[PDB]
Symmetry: C6
Subunit: 181 residues, 6 copies
């Protein structure tokens, strides 16, 4: 069976990068972030999680499907007011929501200790990303959100690296991109 991990890391990677260009301040929360969170960071990563089921990878099923659902919850929070369904979110409830996802990311980082180090760097930077976004929203500190953006850019780039690191290593049967096995 094929390896679905690079698809989810690519889905997580490009979607994490784009969101944090806004968090860093390059742009505003554009629909380019919203479209990628629905299909790539969302459904395409949901597909990567469900495909780890027949692979016996409990971590992959848990990681990709959870974060894939996270992007679907993120877009839903931002678009339901534009549909008149809800109110715009409370930033402290957004901080705790971003904080709970940091707790999930934290324990999952310990699950990467016996794994490739490029995946450990992804889950460590994602822990820093979720932790900085949580305190930045609760405290109302826009500077920390700017900091979390640059961490998210590093987080999303390294996720794309491992995605393309796994593919290029399987296509040629040798280490084309070293991932820290």
């Amino acid at each position: 069976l094929a390896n679905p991990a690079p698809l989810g890391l690519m889905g997580f990677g490009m979607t994490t990068i784009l969101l944090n260009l806004h968090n860093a301040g390059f742009f505003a929360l554009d629909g380019i972030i919203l479209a990628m969170g629905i299909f790539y960071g969302g459904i395409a990563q949901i597909f990567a999680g469900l495909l780890e089921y027949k692979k016996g990878n409990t971590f992959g099923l848990t990681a990709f499907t959870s974060y894939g659902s996270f992007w679907l919850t993120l877009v839903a929070i931002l678009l339901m007011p534009k549909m008149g369904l809800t109110e715009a979110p409370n930033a402290q409830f957004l901080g705790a929501y971003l904080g709970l996802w940091g707790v999930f990311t934290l324990f999952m980082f310990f699950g990467t200790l016996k794994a490739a180090r490029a995946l450990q760097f992804v889950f460590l930077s994602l822990t820093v990303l979720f932790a900085l976004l949580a305190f930045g929203n609760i405290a109302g500190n826009e500077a920390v959100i700017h900091v979390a953006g640059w961490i998210g850019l590093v987080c999303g780039a390294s996720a794309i690296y491992l995605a393309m690191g796994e593919v290029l290593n399987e296509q040629f049967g040798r280490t084309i991109l070293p991932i820290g096995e």
Copy 2:
């Protein structure tokens, strides 16, 4: 085949904490509760429930798919009035609705006895969570609703703890977080 239980416990646990942060009085019924109740506590738990089928886990198939269906139904209750389809729910009807989920949770708690004791603590606290949410809403007693909020914060936290207990114990091949594994 992979173990889907951490996916259903994380979706149930994370969403339960956020909803009961509102019942405890910290925040109002914000859109984050509704978003988590659709995709993580809802659809992601449906997946985790459906993935118990080929695993031969009738309990996990029943529980995760039902609680995933619970979160989906609870969201449609709170959003259909804003869609102009229905009206705001009769609060006492919501008590029997949650009370039926308490009856389901109570019976399912008896099914956890020969499982991990963390799972027994999840289904027992969830039974107490659904119960105080039913009574406090039927009688309109905001105090027990606040007390129900604190019980759920423990119930959701123990479900996340059990999910991550199951993840680390397989990633390390040794009991990293003791889940009372029978």
Copy 3:
């Protein structure tokens, strides 16, 4: 493979009680019944029906997928007018619609004659539930609708007992809740 019957009986059983809590006159036809009819009584029972396909259960594939579709059709009957698509449903038409579900349920009840005594009670009371609801809708009889609610409350409560009977008995490997297997 796991047993999908407790999942379908629970979704059907809970939505039956909640529906007939309105048929008994306690509450109006709430959005709680509509939401429970879509996902738990409907789609969750659609899933439980399809799971019976690889189980070799023609009856379970036919029953759960039909009653799961019933809750989906019933919700569409009551919600399409609110969208400007449909008029209010005709009371005599809705009774024939309930009668056809009672006719289908009647034949399926005889299919349970060689199964657990608890499953026989579920299909027996559901046939009387559909019949009283069909008769009460065609005739416009408030009292028959009230009696149907009490029939449905017990029918949905017994379906929960059978579902939880099939859950606990497999957990402990013996009869914890007797179901007349």
Copy 4:
């Protein structure tokens, strides 16, 4: 594997019966017909067709999926104007559309000659149903549509019969309802 044919015949059966109570004149084109054509006569019969794939039944895959899609096309024709998307259909284009489905039903009736006669009666009455509906719409003859309704009631009833005939015969392992094998 389970037998998905009774689910489709039940999905086709109840949906064919209800539509032709309007075609016969008992009621108007209510949403009860529209809801059943979306989920039962549509999706639930689509499920019956896709499940005949692993059964090697080319006829079952072709029959249930085609007529399941037919109900989805029927509801789409009737509801797209109510959504402002299209114009109300031209009855001659509806007659040819109903006529083309009769041609499909005609050749599929010859495919039932070496099969159970209860299925032959279904596809023969469905051929009469589609043929009467086609000429009735093209000619503008409301009387023939009244005739096609009563044929559709017989067609939908016999389809439910075979659906419950196959289930009750498999549950007991003997002929409970004779279908003309």
Copy 5:
């Protein structure tokens, strides 16, 4: 495993006839063309295309899923303006769009040579169908559009004939309708 080709040929054939009854001048672009292009000519052919995967039929997987995708795209072209999303399509753009489908149909016709000669007649007439629909719409020549309508009525009829030829030949175990089976 079942033979899904009659499902894709019936959905393609039935929908092709109805659309080209309009191109021949009998009727206007009515909602029946749009309904058939979604569920039968579209989704039902996607299913028939997806069901060729485990059958090892790269041709049937490619053709049915693409032509099912064609009918879905053609409907979204004609309905998005009514939805207020887009504007009415540039007629000459629709000619290159159909011309690309003619290029796809032409190459796929060469793949039918070692198949049933009825299938060769389907893909050859379909190539002529897409071609005259492209030219007559690029130049705005309503006459060849009408001539394209008559070609499609034959192309759709031969696809239905081949579908029912495949059904009866398996139901009877003997060639009931000769499809030029190689």
Copy 6:
């Protein structure tokens, strides 16, 4: 199992030509490109990607499912404003979005170094296609967008040749259209 690559290359190849017929300046960004981006270039390529999972093709599972998601994200970028959900996409943001798809395409191009010479041309021209579209969107260069269209017309036309090359060659069992296998 069948080969899903011709289905995905056709959907990507046709939608590439149609998109770049607007990038070349011949037509405006039509609804024909949006519809072809949803179903053929998008979902049909999503199907073709998932089919590669049981084929053991990590590259094909990653490529088709990503570019199929790309056409789905691109259509959502251009249609969400028309629904009142989103502002118009930023030209510099859209260029970075195109650049990330070019970065992903660049690494995947090296994955084709041990495959057919026709697949190498597809990923080579698509990388230049994304780069010119990314550069032309960030800089706002009408001429670079025009050159990108001609790059895309040939890229989509060659993808059709490779797809039809993989179709005909399996039909006849020999090389009918040379692809550099």
